[PDB]
Structure 1
């Protein structure tokens, strides 16, 4: 029957998986957007958040850390630099129609890669019963920040595991029952397979990004707007527009032992 692989491949995607990419969000009624440090949802996927906040979809944050380290000022202690930074995200979010932010409070550059941490995200997933999760892609070539790498990993890991009753069993017997999230979307990806048109809202994104004043001196912004405009244009060039934000959405089966998963 199945002449070759590629004949069975396209049938496994349309018939079996109901896999689609012109509109993967669409039916989204609530999505948590996971970021390693505060400002990552902004820089990563700010426009697409506003878009999903103009469409009346509920956007919740989980911020892995407290950005305790993002300063060169030999006189501004991380403890407050972090106070400074929970304000700057409470600002940023307010702009983007992000209302809620869970704060995991793990110190910056010290985000563990453990089960403890997975018990945080799995806990939050069974409670906010989110339709999709927005996490950063960990297989981003040359990514050198452990927090980024680990975040996307736990993100996808906690996701697949939240369905699992015997995982963090203490959750089951206090009200929280397993939940099957609908889609996983990987911002900060070098292999996007769905770009959102953000050409328009590309001016509210920098005001959400810059809102983090602590992280953005005007002096350093002299290399970051030239930077951000370069990135967003690369996502746009894939679907012929001025600005773009890129995501990787794969079917749930391709996140595990799928040798051909690099074809979509």
Structure 2
């Protein structure tokens, strides 16, 4: 096979088009149920809140997994992390209602303390096998200069957990209690410097910002003086790539390209 192509460029295009059937025309078109994985309460709204409302409005069931409890998100010396986590849970329930999301799984690892371990893969794999989502969204763990370990670990653990949910010897007691292996159809990484699919969110921008500001403990007015400019600059970064005012960017690749593929950066 692949004996009659003559150049690498020809093989490459034939591998993507024919063998992997990859395309970026509308990667989310067939989804019925997706899971959006966030490191902290508010990252699904920040990274992809317009696209979550577009999906919910088309009748896609969007479920969150939140990896941590947001305990550390305050500079108030009188607000304990326990009290903040309870406040953030209610904030995310109000944000998610605005975006059409009706189910959140809380892993409850402490903020700044998310482990990078098989145990946390097992939590993700248990929920993937229970819910059988078509798509999974998570942060791109290769974002340049990303300095928060919870973000880098969420992205790597989500990619690994999507792969290992298909393997019956990984977390085998799930198979023994009736949670069968599941093969997700696509992963999409948000918070990405290298998007290859952009969703125009220009007419949902105000709704997105409203869903973000529902995390009131995080976005005081003072903080918003910097964050609204930031968030509009990011959405213009994405939207300008497809000639629209505001966009949300995602990186999607064939499953093969997440492993031993030396030209994965050509898409």
* TM-score (normalizing by structure 2): 0.98
| 1:202-237 deviations in Å (ceiling 9; x for gaps) | 000000000000001001100000110000000001
Give the drift of 1:250: 0.3
The one-character-per-residue Cα deviations of 1:178-208 (angstroms, maximum 9, x if unpaired) are 0000000000000000000100000000000
Task: Please give the alpha-carbon distance, in whole angstroms, between the structure 2 residues aligned to 1:22 and 1:56.
Answer: 20
Q: What is the aligned-residue RMSD (CA, Å)?
A: 0.4
Give, in whole Å, the separation in 2 of the partners of 1:227 and 1:7: 41
**Matches of 1:93 and 1:220, distance apart in 2:** 21
Equivalent residue for 1:144?
A: 147
Q: Distance in 2 between matches of 1:90 and 1:223?
A: 24
Secondary structure, aligned partner of 1:200? helix
Deviation at 1:2, TM superposition (A): 1.2
Instruction: List runs of 5+ in structure 1 lacking aligned partners.
Output: none
Supply the distance in 1 between the matched residues of 2:115 and 2:20 (Cα, whole angstroms). Answer: 34
- Where 1:219 maps in the other structure, the secondary structure is helix
Secondary structure, counterpart of 2:164 in structure 1: helix
Counterpart CA distance in 1 for 2:83 and 2:119 is 25
Q: Does 1:132 align with 2:121?
A: no
Tell me which stretches of 4 or more aligned residues in structure 1 moved more than 6 Å. Answer: none
The alpha-carbon deviation at position 153 of structure 1 amounts to 0.3
Counterparts of residues 35-74 of structure 1 (less than 5 Å): 35-74=38-77
**1:43-91 alpha-carbon deviations (Å, 9 max, x no partner):** 0000000000100000000000000000000000000100000000000
Length, aligned pairs only: 264
Q: Aligned partners of 1:211 and 1:129: how far apart in 2?
A: 29
Task: Tell me, yes or no, if structure 1 residue 110 matches structure 2 residue 113.
Answer: yes
Q: TM-score, normalised by structure 1?
A: 1.00
What SS class does the counterpart of residue 172 from structure 2 fall into?
coil
CA distance in 2, matches of 1:80, 1:175: 37
How far is 1:258 from its partner? 0.4
The alpha-carbon deviation at position 176 of structure 1 amounts to 0.2
